[PDB]
């Protein structure tokens, strides 16, 4: 029964426009709707009527095709829209009074969803101009749905893009609870993980929550205020006003950067009285090019002339509160009559989604045109393959369609039947006096963000990067995981020996290698040289040189005077073995102090093994001779004893072959030593000790022999001193790391005491 | 325009019955349906007409309420059903010619789903009588849906229940591919995991697959034929025929137990010609009580009398291929006329879902009655709160409704708007000759399965339990995981020392504990006793006794004759120390061989430490005396030497305090020994060795002293033998576990050789 605005045509596009207000709870079953909507309603019906006239008058597309329409009141309520959609469907069915080819979707998403659920069963393509819910992106559930508006998912995309632009990490996130805000925050946090942006706490409040509730929410948000300053509300306007109430009450303004979605977009009524409260906030609007087409088509519309629109007349009486008695719709509500002088241009503000409506209409027109060109390239009108027009092929054409819209830019439909995003970023800035207002600060389009950074803050004193992680020191400071968020670093330095393995992971490289200046990596420290002017090495060298000079002098003296009683007092043949042993022992000091080559690794051990063994073998033979007392015999004994230690050295070579060892006293210290282990040093020392104990046993028996001018007494004393020195320096050797120096001093002083205690009396006597 | 069977009433229940056949592809847009369905169609319209008359005539419920109906052709096709549903909805809307309160759902599930998608938007409760798809169980998607039939999920439940009853694990599973079979197999495998039933391989074929494809499927199934014998097909009849073609071709019958869902339920046409092919198969049907109500209401229906049903007349001409020229529906298709004598009782077979239709009708009637009683307990007719009847409250009543159905049992609606399952299990058994047919073998109801096991196989020679895991041996056989399925055990035995920790997991308990007979657990083996009649212990005891007798005799003899030259030859005072040492050493043997008590742990070590040390201390003093040669002095030396070893024992007690050790030579052997470690045995042995070496050194000097009638020579020889024995038995001690026995023999023989070599000559001389 309800009146339908019917424009005649050949291919007939239906539409649902929210002409009347939502009926209250009392008339949900009767379904008597409220007052006529001005901005959302009749503007749109006039829009499509004029648009269809223009398309009818445009030879550019659909040449011999006339497009009619039916406008049915949608009342912004699901029930009424469903009634009207039923009327559409039955008309189309009984047609098979004319079949509806497609339909322009209702405003609200919560209504468009149900209308889609109904239309999906009859292959009726629907195009929406206001449905922005992202649950309509599915094609499993809503196959026949087309949007010239981007979903709220793309609002979330724009917000995350601008946050990325301003380089923030630890931002707070609140959202209105319901269909809108909840899903919006889900999308936002979905697209946050792809950017590494952290979220403080996904707070969730109503628009009807108490002032106390709002204050509690503000306190909860401010709990992390020092760290988190940018609060993204996927918020309704009333939520914004609630938060502003809370901010004025708590007085915690300034740090709270209110980044809002399409809530307080341009709606200053949201923030009237609270201009100072939320200055510097960032919001988003849909791009709405003011279309002059409708301005010209609409401002010249008088009630009498505009006969085609049925309720328009009625609208007049409500628009101006005047009762046009002359007009058939002589409503008794208004007292005064309507003056002919009263025009419509006054207070004329067109809807904020006018571009979208026109875009949807052209979208369907171009869909039909594309399908016509695909299937009817013959007759300029309706071909054979179009007479039973089917929704499947029309939707197929509509998926793969594009054109320049009335707005100015192109309209593309992706896989999910969504137009690309087209947003304007705006800031609630303050003027000179208390006249704060909204100003455009750039645009967001299809992914590319063109913001005007210089416009906001007017300087480089913006809100600090809300982050839980200050940039770590490039030296050794490594990130940690506090377990709270994914961007809360405690830049604790790595170990002195560690390097920067990763940004979040630290490691220390292999032994010997030490990190660089900035711990970029690590490098191997040079090995020790062991030929130095160090006091201890030079002291050893001086001692060895003095010993060599003394040995050479005494050797020469004893070789020349080989018949004197003083020389005859001792073995005039076996002393050469002593001299050779002593000289080799002295040269051992020089052997150790050099570059520790493989050949040197051989020679050093060879010398330090042979020379002491040889010397003490001669000593033990001499002591045995003395014991016999109180010479082609003892030579063989001495040779065998020397060969014993030579065999020991050979066996040690066989067991553990020498190689140039990179000795590591620490990990930050690298020295170069041969592979002489504990066994490799003890074994020669063991044999030397055995010979020394033998000498001690065979000489202690003759501790008090003053023969040859007090010879044996001083020899015994010196040997006791030598034994004491050996037993004292063995632990000093093992309890230190200056191994080469210790061996040098030990052998040098051993030979020195021996030579200086057995030969100095002899030299003094002879000269 | 399409003719609607309209029964007048006050509360009007619509219905959709598949009156005509599905229109072919050529007339999907024209929507001209095919021939009139007999079994599925007009039976049901007559059913509901008579049922509504009866409910109208029953004062038991809805006293002053008359129920009308509209029957609209459903044509088994989605498009026609949607057209008719649109008509219903528009009638109901314009009513607000009379409002439809509810609707009886279309037959097919693929049609009921779409009709539900349409009706959900208008609060129109729908009850289905044939929709068995389990995607309709959801209430998120299909809120206003009621089923008097159970879903296919419950067919899967029944199959899994019977498999559980017959106790099978490793069963093959095949399913028709599509809406039916795929979802059915999903449900079956869902409910299999709750029972631990394994699946061979979820094979998936069409009903249109080639004979080659069917043969390939049969080969794939038979690939596991020895292990898996029961093949559950959630199968269409054509799939069954395909599998039977394959079975006849391959000739792999017998082992293949065809457990089928509602495919070849009673449809012998599926298995005609293949009676021998799939004997012994198990199938399921919906319980269909043959309702005599409809039999009486329907058999007395003549075309002329039955004016209320519009197409019934037409049905007549198609039912009998006679053209009733007299009747207004004088179809020209049939040549012959209709004889008045021609009745309808011939070949009368009612539909297999008659009970379900009547149950649905009564279900809606009882829903209305319950809601009436809930809201209108006043006027016997329509109260105030019912005039604008709403679907929400009607569905609320329908959810919480129950009654005794026409079938005989109750109808309950759970949370998901589903009636409980009611199935009859049937077997394709063989008669005497080649006359194999279906026979009922029990029922399944709401969860309780009442099968007739004795009916099937007629003996205990059923199909073997198709399992991958034979029952493991109760001893130590543990299950494994081959990685193929969750019930493929290889009953490998556990370790000899292991126990049955779990059915699938094995473990071995703590040390010492050994498993029981059946490895139920483990128990601690008793410790060693070490007081035995074993040959070696008894030999030690005999030796010790002989030694004690000899020692006592010689002690007495030497005490009496304490002045003889033979006795005077040795120390006539120090020999008492020797005798006491020897006797204590002998008693050590008895000390070791007993229960190893804590006090015994003390005493044994004390003795074995003191006695040898004391004896050898006296020996070393004697040897020192001899060395002085070649007495209140040596007594103190001996006492000090004894106290040395006593202090050694005390220090060993301090370091490692004795405790009763459960010694474990192996894990299956438990002995009881003190905590005498290597150190605790070597230290006394070390001291003993030191004294022995001292004795050797001091006696080897006097190896050839024939004084006192060849005394020292034999003593030296015996001491050499003793040293050899010690050096030989130390490794024998360390290279064995008979520690107590070894110590006993060592000490006993040491004392024996000592006594028998130092004293036997003396005794022989004196007597
Ligand atoms: N964009 C709207 C608005 C929208 C929204 C989207 C989804 C769910 C709820 C919901 O309600 C709110 C609340 C606050 C801000 C914007 C929205 C749409 O419905 O698509 C737009 C037609 C609606 C209009 O202009 O009134
Ligand atoms: N039980 C049915 C039957 C059914 C089924 C269920 C779901 C999807 C497909 C489908 O097709 C098959 C194929 C073989 C066996 C049974 C089914 C139902 O549609 O509910 C029953 C009304 C259908 C009838 O009697 O024809
Ligand atoms: C982070 O943002 C700042 C401006 O706030 C700017 O330096 C740049 O966009 C980002 N930083 C770097 C190092 O690129
Ligand atoms: C497994 O099934 C068999 C009959 O096939 C029967 O023993 C019983 O139901 C099950 N087994 C046991 C041990 O209960």
DSSP class per residue in A607-647: HHHHHHHHHHHHHHHHHHHHHHH---SHHHHHHHHHHHHHH
Hey, what are B332's tokens? 């020209």
Which string of b and e fits A624-661 if b means at least 16 CB within 10 Å? Answer: ebbeeeeeeebeeebeebbeebeebbeebeeeeebebb
Please give the C-alpha separations between residue B192 and each of A248, A424, B189, in angstroms, as whole numbers.
62, 57, 5
Q: How far apart are CA B38 and CA B48, in angstroms?
A: 15
Q: What is the 3-state secondary structure of A135-178?
A: HHCCCCCCCCEEECCCCHHHHHHHHHHHHHHHCCCEEEEEEECC
Contacts with A665 (C-beta within 8 Å, 6 or more apart), sequence order: A671, A737
Among B65, B631, B637, B105, smallest CA distance to B417 is for B105
What is the distance between the alpha carbons of residues A246 and A240, in angstroms, rounded to a whole number? 10
> What is d(CA B439, CA B441) in angstroms, rounded to the nearest whole number?
6
Q: How far apart are CA A132 and CA A144, in angstroms?
A: 16
- Rounded Cα gap, residues A346 and B307, in angstroms: 68
Q: Which of B110, B19, B5 is nearest to B52 (CA)?
A: B5
Tell me which residues of chain A, numbers 699 to 738, contact chain B at a CB-CB cutoff of 8 Å. Answer: none
How many whole angstroms separate alpha carbon B78 and alpha carbon B72? 13
CB count within 10 Å of CB B67 equals 23
Tell me the HSE value of A186 on the side-chain side, using a 13 A CA sphere: 11
Distance (Å) of CA B348 to CA B38, B46, B269, B305, B352: 10, 14, 19, 19, 13
- Tell me the HSE value of A224 on the side-chain side, using a 13 A CA sphere: 24
* DSSP structural state of residue B20: B
Which residue of chain A has the CA closest to B390?
A29
Length of chain A: 767
CA distances B538 to B180, B542, B604, B747, Å, are 87, 6, 18, 15
- Taking residue B371's Cβ as centre, other Cβ atoms within 10 Å add up to 22
Rounded to whole angstroms, the Cα distance separating B49 from A758 reads 143
Dist. CA A120–CA A136, nearest whole Å: 13
- Measured in angstroms, the CA of B622 and the nearest CA of chain A are apart by 27
Torsion angle of the four alpha carbons A735, A739, A745, A750, in this order, in degrees rounded to the nearest 10: 80
Three-state DSSP class for residue B652: helix
User: How far does Cα A141 stand from its chain's mean position?
Assistant: 36
| Tokens, residue B742 | 């070894």
| B539: its two tokens | 């030999």
Classified as helix, coil or strand, A754 is helix
Distance CA B756, CA A452 (A): 118
Q: Which two tokens mark B123?
A: 């609060």
Residue owning tokens 């209140």: B632
> Shortest CA distance to B224 belongs to which of B186, B278, B261, B170?
B170
**From the list A31, A86, A120, which residue is nearest B89 (CB)?**
A86
- B243 closest CA partner among B211, B268, B273, B275: B211
Residues of chain A with Cβ-Cβ distance to B119 below 8 Å are none
DSSP string, A511-548: SSEEE-SS-SSEEEPPPP------HHHHHHHHHHHHHH
Q: How many CB atoms lie within 10 A of CB B336?
A: 9
- Spell out the residues 6+ positions from residue A635 whose beta carbon is closer than 8 angstroms to its own: A574
Counting ligands in written order, which one lies closest to the CA of residue B165? 4
Is the Cα dihedral A20, A23, A28, A31 positive or negative? negative
Q: Whole-angstrom Cα distance, residue A310 to residue B447?
A: 63
Angle, vertex CA A95, rays to CA A44 and CA A76, nearest 5: 30
Q: Which ligand is nearest to the CA of B464?
A: 4
The ligand placed nearest to the CA atom of residue B462 is 4
Distance from CA of A32 to the nearest CA of B (A): 12
* B421 neighbors B150 (Cβ within 8 angstroms): yes
Helix (H, G, I), strand (E, B) or coil at A700: helix
Helix pair angle (A598-629, A575-592), 10° resolution = 150
- Using alpha carbons, select from B252, B251, B245 the residue that is nearest to residue B270: B245
Q: Identify the H or E element spanning A305.
A: none
Pairing of strands A126-128, A100-104: parallel
* CA A252 to chain CA mean position, Å: 31
Q: A465-478 in b/e burial notation, b at 16+ Cβ within 10 A?
A: ebbbbeebeeebbb
Gap between the Cα atoms of B641 and A295, Å rounded: 129
Residue holding tokens 């002899």? A762
**What 3 state SS string does B536-577 have?**
HHHHHHHHHHHHHHHHHHHHHHHHHCCCCHHHHCCCCCCHHH
CA distance A41 to B484: 66
Across the interface, of A87, A114, A388, the residue whose CB is closest to B29 is A388
CA distances from A142 to A320, A415, B134, B299 (A): 42, 13, 21, 48
Token reading at A117? 């659920």
Check residue A31 and give left, alpha or beta (phi > 0: left; psi -120 to 50: alpha).
Answer: left
Residues in chain B: 767
Other beta carbons less than 10 A from residue B625's beta carbon = 16
Residues 6 or more apart in contact with residue B31 via CB below 8 angstroms = A96, B23, B75, B77, B79, B80, B83
The H or E element containing residue B21 is none
Q: How many CB atoms lie within 10 A of CB A91?
A: 17
Classified as helix, coil or strand, B636 is helix
Chain breaks in chain A (C to N over 2.5 A) after: 96, 630
Q: What is the H or E stretch that residue A428 is in?
A: strand A422-429
Q: Tell me whether strands B522-524 and B661-663 are parallel, antiparallel or unpaired.
A: unpaired
A73 forms beta bridges with A17
Count CB atoms within 10 A of the CB of residue B595. Answer: 12
DSSP codes, A47-112: HHHHHHHHHHT-TTS-TT--EEEEEEE-TTSHHHHHHHHHHHHHHHHHH----EEEEEPPSSHHHH
Q: Given the CA of residue A165, which atom of ligand 3 is nearest to it?
A: 9
Judge whether B190 and B292 are in contact, CB under 8 Å: no
> Whole-angstrom Cα distance, residue A595 to residue A604?
11
Please state, in angstroms and rounded to a whole number, the distance separating the CA atoms of residues B7 and B534.
110
E strands, B261-376, are: 282-286
CB distance B167 to ligand 4 below 6 Å:
yes
DSSP state of B36: B
Determine the Cα angle at B711 with ends B709 and B717, to 5°: 135
B384's CB contacts (< 8 A; 6+ apart) are: none
Cβ atoms B104, B45 nearer than 8 A: no
C-alpha to C-alpha distance for A522 and A667, rounded to whole angstroms:
12
Counted across chains A and B, CB pairs separated by less than 8 A come out at: 36
Cβ atoms of A284 and A158 within 8 Å: the answer is yes
Q: Supply angle C-alpha B19, B21, B23, rounded to 5.
A: 125
Instruction: In whole angstroms, give the CA distance from residue A500 to residue A521.
Output: 7
**How many Cβ atoms sit within 10 Å of the Cβ of residue B464?**
12
Q: Which residue pairs, CB below 8 angstroms and at least 24 apart, start in A124-127?
A: A124/A88, A124/A89, A124/A92, A124/A100, A124/A391, A125/A101, A125/A364, A125/A367, A125/A391, A125/A394, A125/A395, A125/A398, A126/A102, A127/A102, A127/A103, A127/A360, A127/A363, A127/A364, A127/A398
In which residue are the tokens 């001692």 written?
A543
Q: B640: how many CB neighbours lie within 10 A of its CB?
A: 10
C-alpha distance from residue A507 to each of A483, A501, A670 (Å): 21, 5, 20
- Is position A132 annotated in a ligand binding site? yes
Distance CA B254, CA B463 (A): 9
Q: N- to C-terminal Cα distance for chain A?
A: 152
CB contact under 8 A, A120 and B117: yes
Instruction: Identify the closest residue of chain B to A78 by CA–CA distance.
Output: B121
Give the other-Cβ count within 10 Å of B182's Cβ.
15
Q: Which two tokens stand for residue A404?
A: 């320049």
Give the whole-angstrom CA distance, residue A558 versus residue A329. 152
Task: Tell me how crowded residue B693 is: count the other CB atoms within 10 A of its CB.
Answer: 12
A37 φ, ψ (degrees, to nearest 5)? -75, 135
* CA B439 vs CA B265, B436, B462, B463, B654: distances in Å: 11, 9, 17, 18, 90
Query: Is the CB of B410 inside a 6 Å radius of any atom of ligand 4?
Result: no
- Cα–Cα dist A74/A66, whole Å: 25
B135 touches chain A (CB under 8 A): no
What are the angstrom distances between the C-alpha of A52 and each of A55, A525, B644? 5, 85, 125
Q: What are phi and psi of B441, to 5 degrees?
A: -130, 20
Question: What torsion, rounded to 10 degrees, do the Cα atoms A187, A188, A191, A195 define?
Answer: -170
User: How do beta strands B492-493 and B513-515 pair?
Assistant: unpaired
Nearest to B157 by CA among B449, B452, B410, B438: B449
Distance between first and last Cα of chain B: 152
Residue B241 buriedness (CB in 10 A; 0-12 / 13-18 / 19+): buried
Probe site for chain A from B86, B124, B388, B392 (most A CB atoms < 10 A): B86
Burial class (CB in 10 A: 0-12, 13-18, 19+), A749: middle
User: Cβ contacts of residue A623 below 8 Å, gap of 6+?
Assistant: A694, A695, A698, A699
In A466-525, where does DSSP find H-type helix?
Answer: none
Residue A211 tokens, joined: 């002032």
For residue B638, give both structure tokens.
């001996």
- Give the CA distances from residue B260 to residues A104, B203, B278, B449, in Å, rounded to whole numbers and listed in that order: 50, 14, 11, 17
Query: What are the φ and ψ backbone dihedral angles of B394, each rounded to 5 degrees?
Result: -65, -45
Closest by CA to B201, choosing from B188, B225, B220, B184, is B220
With tokens 């839980």, the residue in question is A468
CB contact burial A374-400 (16+ within 10 A = b; e otherwise) = eebeeeeeeeeebeebebeebbbbbbe
Ligand 4 center to B161 CA (angstroms)? 14
3-state secondary structure of B413: coil
Residues A417, A425: contact at Cβ < 8 Å? no
Distances (CA, A) of B718 to B584, B700, B753: 21, 12, 7
CA dist., res. A128 & res. A48, Å (int):
14
Q: How far apart are CA A375 and CA A367, in angstroms?
A: 12
B120 touches chain A (CB under 8 A): yes
User: How far is Cα A655 from Cα B735, in angstroms, rounded to an integer?
Assistant: 29
Angle between helices B78-95 and A78-95 (to 10 degrees): 130
- DSSP structural state of residue A374: H
- The CA dihedral of A497, A502, A505, A506, to the nearest 10 degrees, is 0
Closest CA to B46 of B299, B240, B244, B277: B299
Among A408, A463, A439, A540, smallest CA distance to A258 is for A463
């Amino acid at each position: 029964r309800r009146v339908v605005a019917h424009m005649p045509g050949d291919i007939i596009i239906g539409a649902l426009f929210s002409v009347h207000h939502q009926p209250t709870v009392d008339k949900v079953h009767e379904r008597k709707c409220g007052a006529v909507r001005e901005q959302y309603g009749i503007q749109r019906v006039e829009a499509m009527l004029h648009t269809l006239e223009r398309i009818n008058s445009d030879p550019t597309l659909l040449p011999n095709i006339t497009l009619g329409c039916e406008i049915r009141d949608s009342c912004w309520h699901s029930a009424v829209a469903l009634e009207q959609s039923i009327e559409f469907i039955r008309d189309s069915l009984i047609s098979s009074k004319k079949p509806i080819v497609g339909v322009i979707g209702p405003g609200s998403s919560s209504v468009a969803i149900q209308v889609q659920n109904l239309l999906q069963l009859f292959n009726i393509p629907q195009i929406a101009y206001s449905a922005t819910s992202m649950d309509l992106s599915d094609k499993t559930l809503f196959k026949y749905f087309m949007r010239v508006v981007p979903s709220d998912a793309q609002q979330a995309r724009a917000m995350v893009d601008i946050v990325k632009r301003y380089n923030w990490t630890y931002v707070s996130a609140v959202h209105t609870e319901g269909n809108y805000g909840e899903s919006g925050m889900e999308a936002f946090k979905d697209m946050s993980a792809k950017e590494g942006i952290c979220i403080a706490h996904s707070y969730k409040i109503y628009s009807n929550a108490g002032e106390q509730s709002f204050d509690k929410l503000l306190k909860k948000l401010t709990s992390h205020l020092p760290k988190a300053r940018v609060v993204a509300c996927f918020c309704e306007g009333m939520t914004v006003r609630g938060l502003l109430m809370a901010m004025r009450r708590l007085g915690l303004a300034g740090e709270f950067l209110l980044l809002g979605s399409d809530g307080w977009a341009d709606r200053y009524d949201v923030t009237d009285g609270y201009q100072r409260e939320a200055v510097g906030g960032i919001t988003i609007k849909l791009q709405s090019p003011d279309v002059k087409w409708f301005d010209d088509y609409y401002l010249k519309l008088r009630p009498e002339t505009n006969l085609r629109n049925p309720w328009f007349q009625e609208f007049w009486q409500h628009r101006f509160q005047c009762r046009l008695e002359g007009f058939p719709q002589e409503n008794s509500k208004y007292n005064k009559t309507c003056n002919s002088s009263l025009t419509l241009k006054t207070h004329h503000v067109q809807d904020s989604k006018m571009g979208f409506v026109i875009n949807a209409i052209y979208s369907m027109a171009y869909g039909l045109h594309n399908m016509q060109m695909s299937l009817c390239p013959g007759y300029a009108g309706l071909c054979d393959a179009m007479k039973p027009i089917d929704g499947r092929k029309l939707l197929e054409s509509l998926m793969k369609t594009a054109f320049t819209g009335v707005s100015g830019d192109t309209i593309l439909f992706d896989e999910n039947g969504d137009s690309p995003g087209r947003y304007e970023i705006m800031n609630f800035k303050e003027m000179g006096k208390d006249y704060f207002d909204y100003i455009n600060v750039g645009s967001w389009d299809n992914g590319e963000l063109k913001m005007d950074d210089d416009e906001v803050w007017s300087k480089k004193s913006n809100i600090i990067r809300s982050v839980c992680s200050e940039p770590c020191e490039k030296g050794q400071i490594k990130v940690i995981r506090k377990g709270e968020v994914s961007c809360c670093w405690t830049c604790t330095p790595c170990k002195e020996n560690e390097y920067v393995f990763d940004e979040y992971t630290c490691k220390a490289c292999q032994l010997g290698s030490w990190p660089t200046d900035d711990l970029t990596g690590c490098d191997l420290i040079p090995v020790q040289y062991l030929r130095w002017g160090d006091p201890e090495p030079i002291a050893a060298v001086v001692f060895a040189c003095l010993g060599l000079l003394a040995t050479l002098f005494v050797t020469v003296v004893f070789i020349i005077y080989r018949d004197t009683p003083v020389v005859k007092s001792s073995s005039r043949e076996l002393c050469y073995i002593i001299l050779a042993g002593i000289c080799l022992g002295y040269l051992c000091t020089f052997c150790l102090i050099a570059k520790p080559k493989q050949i040197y690794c051989y020679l050093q051990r060879i010398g330090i093994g042979l020379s002491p063994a040889m010397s003490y073998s001669a000593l033990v033979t001499k002591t045995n001779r003395i014991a016999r007392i109180l010479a082609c015999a003892q030579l063989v004994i001495a040779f065998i004893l020397i060969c014993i230690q030579l065999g020991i050295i050979v066996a040690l070579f066989i067991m553990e072959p020498p190689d140039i060892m990179h000795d590591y006293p620490s990990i930050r210290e690298v020295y170069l030593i041969c592979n002489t282990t504990n066994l490799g040093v003890v074994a020669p020392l063991g044999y030397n000790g055995l010979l020394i104990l033998a000498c001690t046993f065979y000489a202690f028996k003759t501790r008090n022999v003053p023969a040859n001018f007090n010879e044996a007494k001083y020899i015994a004393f010196a040997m006791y001193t030598t034994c004491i020195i050996w037993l004292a320096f063995v632990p000093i050797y093992f309890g230190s790391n200056y191994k080469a120096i210790t061996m040098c001093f030990s052998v040098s002083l051993s030979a020195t005491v021996l030579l200086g205690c057995m030969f100095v009396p002899k030299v003094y006597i002879i000269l």
